[PDB]
């Protein structure tokens, strides 16, 4: 019988392509608050 390179019977599994840049990090308020907290401890 004919034998040549073919996809599997059900096809290949799904393939991602869409952009994915995960959302990380604390908010602006929390980050500024930690910065000021460090400053005040330094000054003291």
């Amino acid at each position: 019988k004919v034998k040549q390179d073919m996809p599997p019977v059900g096809g290949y599994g799904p393939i991602d392509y869409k952009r994915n840049l995960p959302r990380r990090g604390l908010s602006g308020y929390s980050m500024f608050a930690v910065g000021i907290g460090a400053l005040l401890f330094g000054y003291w």
């Binding site: 910065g35 460090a38 400053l39 401890f41 330094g42 000054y43």
Partner: protein
Amino acid sequence: MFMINILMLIIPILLAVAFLTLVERKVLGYMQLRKGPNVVGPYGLLQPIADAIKLFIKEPLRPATSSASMFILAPIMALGLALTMWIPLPMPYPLINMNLGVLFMLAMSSLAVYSILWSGWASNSKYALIGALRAVAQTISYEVTLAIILLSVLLMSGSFTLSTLITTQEQMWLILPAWPLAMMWFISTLAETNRAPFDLTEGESELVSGFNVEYAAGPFALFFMAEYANIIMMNIFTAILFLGTSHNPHMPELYTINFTIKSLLLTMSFLWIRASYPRFRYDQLMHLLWKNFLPLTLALCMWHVSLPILTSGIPPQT
């Protein structure tokens, strides 16, 4: 016994510089999914020696159009001044204890710029000239902000003596009360050392090699040794300024180990930054410092004059 101490400073500096070239190529390599030098000596440990020997037996060229005396003078100034930057550094004891060590370092940094300007001008070639004039712009960009950043920090130390910074930071690193200045200082040292993303006076992808494009063999090596020596020296300066190591007078070598680790990591950060970012445009560098750092640096300078006075925490003069 002082001459021995001088040699035990500059021989190690040049050896550390040579192996910083290997470390950079390996660190960049692994960050780039490759290895970097690993064939010349085990783990590439003889690679800096091969390059050094190669360059100093390579034919040095004096360009037909160059100004001979200035062409030779500039690389000599570059390396000479780079080694001079190390003499007041307290590790923990300076080779030369200066009252105004910080001011000395500022002045010598300014003088080292002329090794770029004169080498580029003396080459009498267009890419060399363009590189040198980029150094003029770079110096104009960072120098004013760099001095005022130091001033704000020294208002907590109380003196221009480098060894006092050790005393100042005995309880706590100055990075805590002055991390905004540390941020701006760290960037300024990249610009000061012509390091990426501020590698503009060489700007390989734009100027081929910029100010040193006409230099070959040993004269070129002098410029390379100078820049890499300044990169290490400026991160030692950053460690002393902001990450003060505690000093036990009876175990001075514990200071040296702790301080050496900090300076190394700060130097590794320079390589890390080079691996990560694109290059600035040299007018965009000037706008970064003048339109962002300088307004903030002026404001913080006002704050750090007032803060000791209002908190009754002015440091001792001595």
